């Protein structure tokens, strides 16, 4: 009861949670969600016209 509060006070829980969830951003959208591609227009875009 006194030890868990020490970890919560000093942010050790935050450091461990960052280590075991956020430092292993692996799959797709987390890494590649903030990038940019320009364009290339294909026919599948313009067909109803």
């Amino acid at each position: 009861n006194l030890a868990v509060l020490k970890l919560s006070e000093q942010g050790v829980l935050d450091k461990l949670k960052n280590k075991w969830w956020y430092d292993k951003g692996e799959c797709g959208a987390k890494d590649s969600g903030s990038k940019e591609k320009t364009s290339a227009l294909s026919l599948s875009n313009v067909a109803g016209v």
Partner: protein
Amino acid sequence: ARDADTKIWNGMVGELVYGKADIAIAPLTITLVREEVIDFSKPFMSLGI
């Protein structure tokens, strides 16, 4: 969880109720029906369904 009609707690619960195991640092959820047989510290990580 407990057994019907015999209250036989299996799993990690009975390991602490029946004097088998000494401590359990594990993903265990504080409920109402678990405080009567074992004791929990202050919670260290929040979540939801």
